[PDB]
Design goal:
4 copies of one chain form a homotetramer. With 397 residues, the first copy, chain A, is of the alpha+beta class. Chain A contains 7 helices and 23 strands. In chain A, the strands form 5 sheets. Chain A has a 6-stranded mixed β-sheet with strand order 4-5-1-6-7-8, with helices on both faces. In chain A, strands 9-10-16-13-12-17 form a 6-stranded antiparallel β-barrel. Chain A has a 6-stranded antiparallel beta barrel with strand order 18-21-20-19-22-23. In chain A, a hairpin with a 2-residue loop joins strand 19 and strand 20. The longest helix of chain A has 17 residues. The structure holds guanosine-5'-diphosphate (4 copies) and magnesium ion (4 copies). Chains A, B, C, D: It is found in: Mitochondrion.
């Protein structure tokens, strides 16, 4: 069946793990010798991805329509890092909000992060409906949630909100609160969360990994199509490093065979017309003409690694100038702390403003790492590509 | 129940009006029903919108779930002008493709136009299935349409494609091809085409209509919130006329009453901190900080008005410099004709590249008119905001 | 007295009309008929049926046992046209063969036609016995006739053969040859030619004349039961137009009353379970399931109308495509002329092969007309139902 | 004396055997139809028709006008299997109906089988008139029987119905009910039941037994002409294995001599023009062009043999592909238990739908066997040739 990656988000102690466990138990009830229990998921593995350690539980379960890869994390820190470091792909989120607590600070942070990483669809599970002494408490929280969703870019009025008790469901009790709510939840997830797509419909985008030439045929740029479809003869535009080159792809090569087309995910060699090897370089991005434009200024959510993770031992102030690695390029940039913030502490995550020396393909949602010296000092997510201020372009380098 | 605006699109003679008539007839079966017949719909009345005449038929029908306003136009020129002019809202399109003919030129243009004007979802009706013997043909056409959808930005694999005969449906015969296809079509419309929204979850955006001052209180900008929600105390940013002014909305007023918030559709006066009346002007756009960026170069589908439509008398050539009006602003721009067109054919639409003298809010899907002197010679839609090339700078006036 | 439709057949000048006149003469004595002189019967009135003109004399006479409607026609062409169109229904035929001339071409053609239209009983009158020198001739002709009878499907051995002189009978002379032979002929007719039946034991067959709906009850098809018995609750199948629809007849209505059954000859409305108006159309035949199979190709003896009969003025060639009308249906068909035949001349009858665009109920013995636009150009009788050939199926309409 | 195959049919205990015995006496007394007593007959000589067990009692007796091969079977199962396998050919049937019981289930089932096997003539013996007091009971039973006959396609109005007591005739008492009734029965039997005929008038049909070549002369197919007449020069068509080949019989060989014609029952060698040995194969049927059409779907009354008879010791579901043998061909088929039936128990007969991977000559009334491995799991009789559903066609073997 179609595969979908989802995850429970929401403030600590609201029931994310209980829901996840209840889901695995309910769906694995149609016969099953082994399925992850609460405790087994509450204490999840530690995945060291690029020096950063994040405790995350990954369970799999299937509905009558889709196979799901579900991640649940023990603490808020795991979510922040995980969502910013783009370790676990995500097509949709199950926002768990304990009825008796209502949206909490982490509830909002996760929503922001889910929005910023590209999640456009969320399903809300108002958990702990068993511990509620007022049905008034429920109707009120749903309203607050829909407004919260809209506040964070989601269609609050369209978002499915299921009310129930993940606990009752996990301990197979009071079906109207437990089992039923979870079924209603899974149904909402099957219908509201879109199935992943290789985004073949978006303008092709190919980060140039390398360049080479074949005597007698021309210059070839290699790379993996991150999205769209590249067709032989298609017009292309290379962007980055303060340059814009418009030409045509006269040939596509994969597995030593000439092809008429390549699609997102294909590692290919694109033969381009007229251009010579010195005209191109790793770092440029070949895209459908006019589909994207380089950005030199960006706002990004950035996790600053701790010394343990191999990052900085001390904080840094505005105008700190590490080198940003994103896609296949690397570019020097200047970090600008938010108003107030005088120091950027290691282990801390914040919304930073980054200005690259030269405009590069830096799309919203695009991930990057910051390196100073030979170590990674931060990992981030582009959240906005604000307009370069008059003072910004008057920056020194 | 929910109201949704839809319309049939596709190449002439593929069955758009027959399908429309079939739908009305079928949904007319019982209740307080008075439906329009083929002839009535085919002989679409003309309508004038800002000096531009268009033959368009409008019918209404409701499924069990929604009410629909449906637009069907006789000729291709009708759709081109109607979709570029932005006369009415379009939440979804019903792309009609005749099975024997397969996708044709107008099939492509309408899809592109639909995507450009903002239609995110279309449902496809492969018509005239009755006129085919080889289901082999139909299968190929469906595959072809899915690639076509993907080619134009729509999720081809996800798009509902219904095969049938609008004629059999209209003439109440061969139900598997007729009635049942129409029922499947309407279901798909009900489920795949989103209900309109006021986009309250999007970043607030307020095109400034005017500016005034209240002694002892401050400067006020007036305008109608185009999307999102504005709250008293919200940080805001004015964009346009090469200016980036960031401040805060300290007061929102409507009906001579102060408000804590306003949302899309509200015509309001927004009191802003610090700024003076000379610091602002009609044409600027007040938006959530960093949400949008002004553009100076844009690609657009532009309809060149006819001489009798009040358009220009002499077709203009590349580098013509009309004045662009969009939102509440006006700005000089330079036009660059498409590669392959030496002149802007009157009464014809084309893909122009326009460069504004100054960056202004010009979002994709945004409409604008081009005026030469006091007369409008073209009305367009932003389709892309390409990277401003070094050459595009060197151009003067 | 039961009623039987009979008629004389046989070669021109063999004595059909004289015999017919002799019969009325002999029966007029006892008041079982009004004597019609040879001259009155010979100068047969011209009649017009669906434009087709044929001269036929109709006389009525009664034997003590039955009442008879006797048809006698002047020329071979009248017989051919009459039998192909079935203008004068025949329950049995009196084959007249002149002993002095023996079986002739038309003797064979009439027996063949008689067989093809469903006549199963023929009594023979070997006429002009007064002109045969001896029995050898007669005895030999009789033998030849019985053999001929068997050659065309009849039981030559059981078939009554009366020898005599219709002329002697008519002129009341030579009692043995005349009077006695005619009385013997009539006795044989009374005995060997069975009274007509409604074929109530045959599988019911109801050509659908129209379809209508009764709110709260369902879809009703109307038509005249051509044969068999239809009972409420009976399973039925609708055949034709490449449709295979099986259901049950849940109601039978005639004279605005609900009936439990109807019989051949009844014009009724059959309420059929589950089907909607869209499922059915005039032209389909409702029949006992599996009782009949639609045919798409047939051989038929076809009379091509002259322009005076409203037909074509010019001959047509092989592959001509009129529309065949039979029972309550109409269907395009392609005509294939006989081997050698290069032109179908108006006023000519010939064996044609017709292939329908779609299989329809078209049985051997079934009649049809061929129309080109608004005029009937041919009227035919199905004589065989050959299976479709590979190239036949590969017909382009 | 002419020979006519006959047998009694009717519900159990209605007096079939008694009537049989009563028959062997009345004719063995006068002449030498040597009677066999009730017990002899009642305990019929169990016969085997290809493993298939059939307790059938055979008896011969003659009437001054004919010799008869009369068969009587103990249980319902015997008749079903006997008629389905056609082990004992029937030119006519003697339907026994207890006048006190009237038509019962088996009475109807036997009439249907009789019709399904081609029996066109039945004589009815209303038995046990001695057990009935009122004459109304009787006349009512006769009316019911005539309705029953008509219901099954027989001419209920002309079918001879004899009332009496087979027990009285047998025990020679009450001549009116006994003797005189059986005398009336036999007279009706001699009169109503016609004499068979090889049928030399239908389109020649030659199931191909084998193929061989005569170098310098051509390909020869051998087989016994099942019907019609084949003449040298006649055009022919090979049907089966979806290979429609047409040609001409350039030679006929029987008894090592070249003949001009051959007729039904003749085992011959047919030399066909142009075709090569590879072009033909056993199993194909050579027939007059268009005279017959291959069938890939069929409904049939199939008897599922019992393990004792060699059938699959277990029942089979609607999804089973045994191999079907009929005429000289063999073909894999998919059995489709009718909607409702979930299994096919051995020893049980039922209407089945059969889909052959290829269109073979399988006419209604044609017999076949079904095999699993080298075991015959069922024997059947084709009763209907339904159209292939677009579903049936999309069948993968
Ligand atoms: N009463 C009640 N307690 C619940 C429910 N769901 C979870 N809990 C309890 O709340 C605590 C935190 O739940 P847990 O799933 O670990 O929260 P997480 O941090 O979001 O994963 C545990 O003590 C759970 O047993 C519920 O529906 N009702
Ligand atoms: N055979 C067939 N003709 C159709 C069907 N739908 C429409 N048509 C015919 O196609 C022609 C054009 O249809 P119309 O609805 O006016 O096309 P439009 O130009 O797309 O509006 C008319 O002659 C219709 O009767 C269909 O399902 N089958
Ligand atoms: N000698 C003789 N002539 C006869 C007899 N019956 C008819 N004819 C003559 O044969 C001719 C044709 O007879 P008619 O009845 O018109 O033949 P039809 O064409 O078959 O109707 C006339 O001249 C009749 O008088 C008969 O029994 N004997
Ligand atoms: N009263 C009466 N009994 C009869 C008559 N014919 C047969 N029976 C009885 O009915 C029973 C069944 O008859 P049988 O010939 O075995 O029936 P079958 O199964 O149709 O062969 C036996 O007990 C017979 O004695 C009859 O004319 N009158
Ligand atoms: Mg947890
Ligand atoms: Mg139209
Ligand atoms: Mg005459
Ligand atoms: Mg018995």
């Amino acid at each position: 069946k179609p595969h979908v990656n989802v995850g429970t988000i929401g403030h600590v102690d609201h029931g994310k793990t209980t829901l996840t466990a209840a889901i695995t138990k309910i769906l694995a009830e149609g016969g099953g010798a082994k399925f992850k229990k609460y405790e087994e998921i509450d204490n999840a593995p530690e995945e060291r991805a690029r020096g950063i350690t994040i405790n995350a539980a990954h369970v799999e379960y299937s509905t009558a329509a889709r196979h799901y890869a579900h991640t649940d994390c023990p603490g808020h820190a795991d979510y922040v890092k995980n969502m910013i470091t783009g370790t676990a792909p995500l097509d949709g989120c199950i926002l768990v909000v304990a009825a008796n607590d209502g949206p909490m600070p982490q509830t909002r942070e996760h929503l922001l992060l889910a929005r910023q990483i590209g999640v456009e669809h969320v399903v809300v599970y108002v958990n702990k409906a068993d511990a509620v002494q007022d049905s008034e408490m429920v109707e009120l929280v749903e309203l607050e949630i829909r407004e919260l969703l809209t506040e964070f870019g989601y269609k609050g009025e369209e978002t499915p909100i299921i009310v129930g008790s993940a606990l009752c469901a996990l301990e197979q009790r009071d079906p109207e609160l437990g089992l039923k709510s979870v079924q209603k939840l899974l149904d909402a997830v099957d219908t509201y969360i879109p199935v992943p797509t290789r985004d073949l419909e978006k303008p092709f985008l190919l980060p140039v990994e390398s360049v080479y030439s074949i005597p007698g045929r021309g210059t070839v740029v290699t790379g993996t199509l991150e999205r769209g479809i590249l067709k032989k003869g298609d017009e292309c535009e290379f962007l980055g490093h303060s340059k814009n080159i418009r030409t045509v792809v006269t040939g596509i090569e994969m597995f030593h065979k000439s092809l008429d087309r390549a699609e997102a995910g294909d590692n290919l060699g694109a033969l381009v017309r007229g251009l010579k090897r010195e005209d191109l370089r790793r770092g440029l991005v070949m895209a459908k003409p006019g589909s994207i434009q380089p950005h030199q200024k960006v706002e990004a959510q950035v996790y600053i690694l701790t010394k343990e993770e191999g990052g900085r031992h001390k904080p840094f102030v505005s105008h700190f100038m590490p080198v940003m690695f994103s896609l296949t390029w690397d570019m020097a940039c200047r970090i600008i702390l938010p108003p107030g913030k005088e120091l950027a502490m290691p282990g801390e995550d914040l919304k930073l403003t980054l200005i690259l020396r030269q405009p590069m393909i830096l799309e919203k949602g695009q991930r990057f790492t910051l390196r100073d010296g030979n170590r990674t000092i931060g990992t981030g997510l582009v959240t906005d590509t604000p307009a370069m201020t008059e003072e910004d372009k008057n920056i020194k380098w």
